[PDB]
Amino acid sequence: KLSEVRKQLEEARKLSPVELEKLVREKKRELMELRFQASIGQLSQNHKIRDLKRQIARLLTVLNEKRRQNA
RNA sequence: AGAUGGUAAGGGCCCACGGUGGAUGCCUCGGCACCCGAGCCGAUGAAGGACGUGGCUACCUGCGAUAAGCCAGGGGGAGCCGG
Structure with a gap:
């Protein structure tokens, strides 16, 4: 996953300021859904x-x- | 008529044998002096806190809504995800 942490870095550092803001907003929504249902019982991973x-x-x-x- | 021993409800002294109790000897993540170097933090918000934060976390510590943590550079070389 290390070179994929680097996939994040090297392929999301280098992808627009505005689209970056939008990116992390989406990300927020993702984690929300995660922690959300991961709590509700089954599929708790x-x-x-x-x-x-x-x-x-x-x-x-x-x-x-x-x-x-x-820079 | 004369004789003069005698058991122990319980006790004392004594020994072995237990219970409580923490001594002492030894142990030292802490403490003590002194000696040398080092010596300012803050509006860049300090010293110091409140609340929080981990998939499950009561305390301790760690961080800060980017929460037991992110980025870049250096170390180092088989283990790691706190106690």
Whole structure:
């Protein structure tokens, strides 16, 4: 998954500021559905939940990076 | 008529044998002095907190709605996802 964390980075860092904001919004919705039903009982699966947080993070990080409009 | 021993409800002293009780000896993640270096934090919001945060978490610690955590660079070399 490491080179896929790098898939996130190298293929979502390099994909527009505006579309990035929209990206992480979608991501938010995703995790919402996750934690949501994962609680409701059956199909309660772990892992991915935390991962999504991790995912979220990098996006926003790099978001602010190029959203600090500096390089 | 004379004789002079005698059992123990319970007790004392004594020994072995237990229970409580923590001594002492030894142990040291902590403590003690001194010696050397080091020595400012804050409006960039400090020292210090409240609440929260983990799939399941009561406390401790860790972080901060990007919550037991993200990015880049360096270390290092088989293990890791806190106690």
